[PDB]
Design a protein around this ligand. Structure first.
Ligand SMILES: [K+]
Ligand SMILES: [K+]
Ligand SMILES: [Mg+2]
Ligand SMILES: [Mg+2]
Ligand SMILES: [Mg+2]
Ligand SMILES: [Mg+2]
Ligand SMILES: [Mg+2]
Ligand SMILES: [Mg+2]
Ligand SMILES: [Mg+2]
Ligand SMILES: [Mg+2]
Ligand SMILES: [Mg+2]
Ligand SMILES: [Mg+2]
Ligand SMILES: [Mg+2]
Ligand SMILES: [Mg+2]
Ligand SMILES: [Mg+2]
Ligand SMILES: [Mg+2]
Ligand SMILES: [Mg+2]
Ligand SMILES: [Mg+2]
Ligand SMILES: [Mg+2]
Ligand SMILES: [Mg+2]
Ligand SMILES: [Mg+2]
Ligand SMILES: [Mg+2]
Ligand SMILES: [Mg+2]
Ligand SMILES: [Mg+2]
Ligand SMILES: [Mg+2]
Ligand SMILES: [Mg+2]
Ligand SMILES: [Mg+2]
Ligand SMILES: [Mg+2]
Ligand SMILES: [Mg+2]
Ligand SMILES: [Mg+2]
Ligand SMILES: [Mg+2]
Ligand SMILES: [Mg+2]
Ligand SMILES: [Mg+2]
Ligand SMILES: [Mg+2]
Ligand SMILES: [Mg+2]
Ligand SMILES: [Mg+2]
Lengths: 113, 50, 103, 216, 148
RNA sequence: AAACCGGGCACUACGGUGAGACGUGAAAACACCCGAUCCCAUUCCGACCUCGAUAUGUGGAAUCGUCUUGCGCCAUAUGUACUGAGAUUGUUCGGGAGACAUGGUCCAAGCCCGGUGA
RNA sequence: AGCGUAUGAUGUCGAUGGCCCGAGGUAGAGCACUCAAUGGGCUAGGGUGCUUACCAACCCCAGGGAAACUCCGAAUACAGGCCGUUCUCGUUUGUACAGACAGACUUUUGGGGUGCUAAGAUCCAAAGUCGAGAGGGAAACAGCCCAGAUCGUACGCUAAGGUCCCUAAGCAAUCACUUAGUGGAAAAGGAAGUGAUCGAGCGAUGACAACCAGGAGGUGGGCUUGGAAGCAGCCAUCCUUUGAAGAAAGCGUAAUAGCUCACUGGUCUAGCUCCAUGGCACCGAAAAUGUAUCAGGGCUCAAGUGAUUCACCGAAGCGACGAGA
RNA sequence: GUAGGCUCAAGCAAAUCUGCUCGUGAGCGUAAUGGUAUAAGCCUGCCUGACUGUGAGACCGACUGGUCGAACAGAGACGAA
């Protein structure tokens, strides 16, 4: 079948302008928080960064995803962003690296919307 | 106008298109053509001081 | 003797659009009464169990059409604009006021 | 090398008339009916280049008698596959030449019941312009063919073939020789003898004509 | 098909609207699709399938008689008009309303300019004579068409 | 630093979706090549997905570019169909398709991370 | 419920138009789905005697019908916001009093269904008139055209419709057409009168019509066949000499014979024949008390038809003067 | 009801799987129409919100009456959320 175009969820009562999106490659893990009204990155954490690619041994596994999630949660609380909304792609489930990033963000003290 | 002339028992006679009827139609056409010319000339802009 | 076996029809249902594009709505106003999703719900539009579309916020009806598939959505553009989630107004907006009054 | 090759048909000198046109101030059914009541066919002269924004279009009217005579004498398909000189004057018999152009008649609308001309369309074709033209086919050699001497019948599948043509060497027709055709086998569009600068638009495996088996 | 008389083998519905037939043309003009000669209509109207088959039989018989030997069978006809609309009727001594009547025949709706027959494999004179012979079976005004 | 390159998000049918041909793996990136111990995948199966593992192999599959095109899509005729008002039993004034036909597949363009330039 | 009245109380309306803006799936069109359906190209295959004028699925090309099909798709209409015009409350609502719930006809059968594309039929949509509306026109006339009667006048201007008489006002003006009383009932089809325009073909190289002379040879083509010889039928339909002549277009013969035509030369001399678009005429055209299908006279020496033009007549419409509420 | 997972029908190649075309033509108990693809279809686990009392605001409309519904209180089901 022809795949339908993916739409953001429809607004019901409130805006919720901060959206968390995750990306994983063969070498690095990524996590971007997007400000939807301006299409700008409010906060981002990845193991490809110059300050982070040497402070951890493995930059591609589940442990790296957990570390990047904790770093992103601390950075989000530093920018006074109390809560984010989770966006999963077509192939992403609540398992493995996605689960590690989500659990580390929630454990850092950021509410999930 | 009634256009039923060859059916039924109620006679609606066919009004012949005479030259006098054509003259009246031409007069009505001249009136509507002058009205249309006035509307074309005046339709380019609106009057001010509203 | 002749007899027709066709004499039935059903009562009218009065389906269709009640609020066209640009019309003002208040919460609870029915926008479309339909069978199935002839129009899909958009932002600030609810959908009922008989696929009735109703406004969730005060605002104006706006129609959207997908150019590729032909699917149509109906949105309400809210009168006072978007309202942030209360967790952002309690914390992020107070820090926003602090950042504004420090500037 | 932009000349008709030897041994190929050229446009005839007898039908090389100049089409006379006068300008037309508007478009629509109203002015078209008023022009046809005055004995003129509404028309348009345009070009390929800016198809959006009109084609540098000029609205004209041509005489009904000249168009009817040309379509009757040439034929419908032969009229649409032959270049013409179009002269635009300020009025009929004047001297203020507004445009003198060599144009192809792109389309002509004849009335479905009375076959009176309702619209003629001319596209500007200066040298070096490539036009999609439907060239009619002339079938010769049917009195010499072995297939039709035996009593079989001719299935003429196509009467026109579409070609992309430079404007200089648009053939008025393509002669199809049937003389080496006995019963059963067929000619395709690749078998047509054309100038090398003409390109088939449809695939070469399109059957043109076929001698089908006569009933024993 | 069904040999001579042409109507559908089946229809989705048995009883149709009357419809309107006095209007309708071909807005782009008409050209022959299969043959070199043809018959087109000049008016808009209704033709019964029996009249269409009578005209076809007249063309076929004229080609069968005027040509002999090997060119007798070389004349080919195309029938471009098809009676696919059923008509109904009611018997005598029957009052006006107890439902629609039983189907009684088939008609074809014809527009102005619509091509009715096409001919190939014959001479121009025989095509003209077959067109004249076929026109007398039809209740609509027709015209002889030549490919050009 | 200001441009360029890679990836992620965003924009979007002139920007979509196919086909063919030619290239490209920058000291970097993406993917594949390899495995199935734990998580996960299989109503059988590392086929898919997942978790692992790659001083440098490959761009065969995908992913990037360039052209050629097919459908679409956008723009635009001319004429006709149809139609609103009006009865010279529609001699007028307006609207105007579908199918044709002609061109185009633009221009502009945001944020973050990494690399080269530095 | 909708629609009438009276009397209160509220809105700033109601009505109508402009601009902006919104969803459409009808008319039309088209085949991309469904149904209905035409011709061809390829070949599976079936079946015949390697072969198979026999049919041949699936694809491909051409083609293109539908109220209960839609790749498309109007004009109108409708909803909403704002702003003009009307200065009228005709709007909403309280209270009190109703009547009415049998409708008719006309708008191309060009909004449709049913009926027979019948009905002064019947049933819905959208207008109008009658109902409940007089006046002028349509001979006479509920429903068509024009137009809304408070009253008076022996004043004026107009609408529809008229201007030879009947009958108020033109034997009106200019340019064309018809000679059928067409106008002033009736189709397919026939005939080709009379104009307008554009073609086509032939033509002093002599065309058309007319008169004169030839119209041949292989050949009696082969078959068929009692005979078929140009001419019952089948197949061939070539060639030659020619100025020209068909293996013959008519007739005619049992078959031959014979007489013409196509074709050609001579004489004569100026244009001749058919194609297209549309103009106006002719035939097709028979009912019953009495002409009886311009109302009648009569009209072509238009008072008929097409186009252009000027005056006038014409209503209870509108004005003037006088009078009411 | 919910959470998770999955994607039909038809055609073609190999000749039931595996793939490629294609697009709503499958399914959704039951007529027809409209709708529908990370579903409204199919499979699995647990459940019983197939609750109690209400309801801003609308859609139908002679009236009787019918329909959709954000949201509130209580008691729950499923879900990492
Ligand atoms: K379940
Ligand atoms: K609750
Ligand atoms: Mg009577
Ligand atoms: Mg009467
Ligand atoms: Mg006169
Ligand atoms: Mg007058
Ligand atoms: Mg226009
Ligand atoms: Mg168009
Ligand atoms: Mg239609
Ligand atoms: Mg059609
Ligand atoms: Mg339809
Ligand atoms: Mg409005
Ligand atoms: Mg009653
Ligand atoms: Mg009643
Ligand atoms: Mg009634
Ligand atoms: Mg009507
Ligand atoms: Mg009716
Ligand atoms: Mg009737
Ligand atoms: Mg009646
Ligand atoms: Mg009655
Ligand atoms: Mg009414
Ligand atoms: Mg009464
Ligand atoms: Mg009244
Ligand atoms: Mg009256
Ligand atoms: Mg009277
Ligand atoms: Mg009267
Ligand atoms: Mg009054
Ligand atoms: Mg008098
Ligand atoms: Mg008469
Ligand atoms: Mg007559
Ligand atoms: Mg008598
Ligand atoms: Mg006067
Ligand atoms: Mg008076
Ligand atoms: Mg008065
Ligand atoms: Mg007074
Ligand atoms: Mg799910």
């Amino acid at each position: 079948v022809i795949p339908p175009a993916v739409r953001p969820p429809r607004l019901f009562d409130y805006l919720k302008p901060y959206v968390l999106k995750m990306h994983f490659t063969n070498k690095f893990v990524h996590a971007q928080v997007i400000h939807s009204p301006t299409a700008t990155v409010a906060c981002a954490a990845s193991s490809q960064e110059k300050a982070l690619r040497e402070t951890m041994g493995v930059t591609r596994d589940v442990a790296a995803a957990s570390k990047i999630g904790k770093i992103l949660g601390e950075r989000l609380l530093m920018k006074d962003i109390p809560a984010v909304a989770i966006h999963m792609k077509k192939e992403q489930r609540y398992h493995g690296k996605v689960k590690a990033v989500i659990d580390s963000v929630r454990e850092a003290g950021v509410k999930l919307l | 106008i009634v256009k039923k002339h060859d059916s039924g028992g109620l006679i609606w006679k066919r009004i012949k298109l005479t030259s006098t009827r054509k003259a009246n139609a031409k007069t009505r056409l001249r009136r509507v053509w002058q009205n249309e010319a006035v509307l074309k000339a005046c339709g380019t802009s609106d009057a001010s001081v509203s | 003797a002749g007899s027709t076996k066709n004499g039935r029809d059903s009562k009218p249902k009065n389906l269709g659009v009640k609020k066209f594009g640009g019309e003002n709505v208040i919460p609870g106003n029915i926008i479309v009464r339909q069978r199935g999703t002839r129009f899909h719900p958009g932002d600030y539009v609810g959908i009922g169990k008989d696929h009735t579309l109703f406004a969730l916020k005060e605002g104006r009806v706006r129609f959207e059409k997908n150019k590729i598939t032909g699917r149509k959505w109906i949105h309400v553009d809210p009168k006072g604009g978007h309202v942030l989630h209360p967790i952002y107004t309690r914390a992020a907006a107070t820090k926003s006021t602090q950042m504004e009054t420090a500037s | 090398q932009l000349e008709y090759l030897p041994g190929f048909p050229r446009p005839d000198a007898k039908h090389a008339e100049t089409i006379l046109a006068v300008p037309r101030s508007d478009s629509g059914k109203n002015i078209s009916a008023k022009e046809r009541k005055a004995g003129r066919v509404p028309s348009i002269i345009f070009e390929q280049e800016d198809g959006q924004h009109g084609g540098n279009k000029r609205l004209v009217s041509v005489q009904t008698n000249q168009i009817r005579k040309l379509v009757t004498h040439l034929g419908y398909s032969f009229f649409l596959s032959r270049l013409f000189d179009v002269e635009v004057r300020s009025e009929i018999g004047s001297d203020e030449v507004i445009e003198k152009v060599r144009a192809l008649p792109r389309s002509i609308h004849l009335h479905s019941g009375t076959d009176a001309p309702l619209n003629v369309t001319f596209i500007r074709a200066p040298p070096g312009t490539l036009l999609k033209v439907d060239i009619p086919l002339v079938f010769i050699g049917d009195d010499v063919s072995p297939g039709l001497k035996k009593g079989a019948s001719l299935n003429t599948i196509k009467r026109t073939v579409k070609f992309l043509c430079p404007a200089e060497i648009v053939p008025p027709y393509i002669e199809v020789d049937l003389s080496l055709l006995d019963v059963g086998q067929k000619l395709v569009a690749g078998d047509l003898k054309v100038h090398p600068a003409l390109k088939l638009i449809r695939p070469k495996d399109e059957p043109i004509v076929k001698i089908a088996g006569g009933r024993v | 098909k069904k040999g001579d008389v042409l109507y559908p083998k089946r229809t989705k519905y048995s009883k149709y609207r009357k419809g309107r037939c006095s209007r309708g043309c071909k807005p782009d003009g008409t050209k022959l699709g299969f043959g070199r000669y043809g018959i087109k209509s000049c008016k808009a109207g209704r033709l019964s399938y029996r009249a269409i088959e009578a005209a076809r039989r007249a063309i076929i018989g004229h080609f069968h008689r005027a040509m002999s030997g090997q060119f007798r069978r070389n004349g080919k006809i195309w029938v471009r008009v098809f009676a696919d609309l059923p008509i109904t009727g009611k018997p005598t001594e029957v009052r006006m309303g107890r439902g629609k009547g039983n189907p009684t025949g088939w008609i074809a709706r014809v527009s102005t300019g619509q091509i009715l027959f096409e001919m190939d494999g014959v001479s121009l004179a025989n095509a003209r004579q077959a067109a004249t012979l076929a026109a007398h079976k039809l209740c609509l005004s027709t015209k002889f068409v030549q490919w050009s």
